[PDB]
Amino acid sequence: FSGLEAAIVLIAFVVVAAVFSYVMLGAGFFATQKSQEVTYSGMKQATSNLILDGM
Amino acid sequence: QLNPGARVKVTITAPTGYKPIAGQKFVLEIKPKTGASTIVTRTLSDGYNGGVII
């Protein structure tokens, strides 16, 4: 049994990690960038209120 | 401008058609930007050669 083949796999473990890492970050930024949008809209929802002024 | 706790003499001239005559009520809504808007309704007593509006 040789670690030469272990290397072959170790790539695969690392690569799928990096890809998941890659996407999760992308998934994550979008998560964040979405989380920001709802917040901006959220404040804009309340503060965009319009009012009847006087009689 | 008015510093808070100060006053000014405002002088209104009513437009050609809207000049009220004795016995006719008028309303004046005062609308400061960003603030509660007043209204002052008066009716000239039928009388009133002029002067103070009681």
- In the DSSP assignment, the letter for residue B15 is P
Give the separation between CA B20 and CA B47, rounded to whole angstroms.
13
Angle at B38 between CA B33 and CA B40, to 5 degrees: 140
| CA dihedral of A8, A11, A17, A20, whole degrees rounded to 10 | -90
A vs B: CB pairs below 8 A:
10
Give the separation between CA B49 and CA B51, rounded to whole angstroms.
7
Give the separation between CA A25 and CA A14, rounded to whole angstroms.
16
- In the DSSP assignment, the letter for residue B16 is T
- The enclosing H or E element of A29 equals helix A3-47
Experimental method reported for this structure? cryo-EM
Which residue of chain B has the CA closest to A54?
B37
Contact B8, B30 (CB under 8 A): no
Residue B24's nearest CA partner among B45, B4, B50 is B45
Which residue of chain A has the CA closest to B31?
A54
């009681």: which residue's tokens?
A: B54
- The enclosing H or E element of A43 equals helix A3-47
